[PDB]
Amino acid sequence: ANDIRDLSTTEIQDQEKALKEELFNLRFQLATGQLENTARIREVRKAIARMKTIVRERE
RNA sequence: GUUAAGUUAGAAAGGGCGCACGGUGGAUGCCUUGGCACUAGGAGCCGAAGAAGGACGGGACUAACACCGAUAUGCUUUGGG
Ligand SMILES: [Mg+2]
Ligand SMILES: [Mg+2]
Ligand SMILES: [Mg+2]
Ligand SMILES: [Mg+2]
Ligand SMILES: [Mg+2]
Ligand SMILES: [Mg+2]
Ligand SMILES: [Mg+2]
Ligand SMILES: [Mg+2]
Ligand SMILES: [Mg+2]
Ligand SMILES: [Mg+2]
Ligand SMILES: [Mg+2]
Ligand SMILES: [Mg+2]
Structure with missing residues (x-):
């Protein structure tokens, strides 16, 4: 959380996109039965x- | 021994009264999670910066309640423990 505030408000959204991709893949695996x-x-x-x-x- | 005349018992297909043992049913006793009437203090409004009240959703499993809103069974911070 405090290490999140060290990022330059542009890598933050890259992290958000990567996390969204991971969440979608997790739900795909859960539906298929492989999680x-x-x-x-x-x-x-x-x-x-x-x-x-x-x-x-930050605004 | 037979005959005649006479007298009197007993019986239950079922039923009645008493007693014993069960069933059903939910009274009564005990109890309290919820109510009723007040006292002292506080407070007596919310809304176009979108209200009161709702619909639909959010969980690994989710029909209902409670909580929350696509940041959804929760996020940041300051204190307590
Ligand atoms: Mg008799
Ligand atoms: Mg007979
Ligand atoms: Mg008989
Ligand atoms: Mg009888
Ligand atoms: Mg009788
Ligand atoms: Mg009787
Ligand atoms: Mg009797
Ligand atoms: Mg009974
Ligand atoms: Mg009764
Ligand atoms: Mg009062
Ligand atoms: Mg179910
Ligand atoms: Mg949003």
């Missing part, structure tokens, strides 16, 4: 949410 650990969904969702929070509060 081993399901606790990753919450982690990725919360990571995206806090990226968005930090970007918004």
Whole structure:
């Protein structure tokens, strides 16, 4: 969280895009029946949410 | 022994009264999670910066309640523990 604030508000959105891709792939695997650990969904969702929070509060 | 005349018992297809043992049913007793009437203090409005009240959604599994809103069973920060 504090290490997120060290990024230059442009790599932040690259991180957001990468996380969104990972979340979509996780849901694809869960639907197909090939996801081993399901606790990753919450982690990725919360990571995206806090990226968005930090970007918004920087205005 | 037979005959005649006479007298009196017993019986239950079923039923009645008493008792014993069960079933059904939910009274009664005990209990309280919810109510009723007040007292002292606070507060007596919300909305175009979109209200009151809702619909649909968000969980690994999700029919309902509660919580939340595509940042959705939650995000940042300051304190407590
Ligand atoms: Mg008799
Ligand atoms: Mg007979
Ligand atoms: Mg008989
Ligand atoms: Mg009888
Ligand atoms: Mg009788
Ligand atoms: Mg009787
Ligand atoms: Mg009797
Ligand atoms: Mg009974
Ligand atoms: Mg009764
Ligand atoms: Mg009162
Ligand atoms: Mg179900
Ligand atoms: Mg949004």
